[PDB]
């Protein structure tokens, strides 16, 4: 299965974080695609419901360190 959310995430100080959490999150269980925009200061992510939610991936990203908050 496959569903799509917008994580807004602040405080990701240069593209080091960026790639990061693009990385990390990427190998999260769940976790297909996912494309994370300093630009736009957010995480893309495309996963698997059965797997992982919005909301768990967020707790992630904030176990990390950085301020998330779902947009969409």
């Known amino acids: 299965l496959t569903q799509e959310t917008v994580i807004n995430i602040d ?3 240069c593209n ?3 790639q990061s ?3 990390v999150i990427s190998k999260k269980p769940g976790v297909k695609s ?3 925009s300093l630009a736009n200061s957010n995480g893309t992510v ?3 419901p059965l797997l992982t939610s919005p909301e768990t991936l967020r707790g992630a990203i904030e176990d990390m360190g950085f301020d998330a908050t779902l947009s969409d």
Do not use: N
């Open 11 to 13: 405080g990701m100080t």
């Open 16 to 18: 080091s974080c960026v």
């Open 21 to 23: 959490i693009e990385g």
């Open 34 to 36: 996912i494309r994370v």
């Open 46 to 48: 495309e996963y698997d």
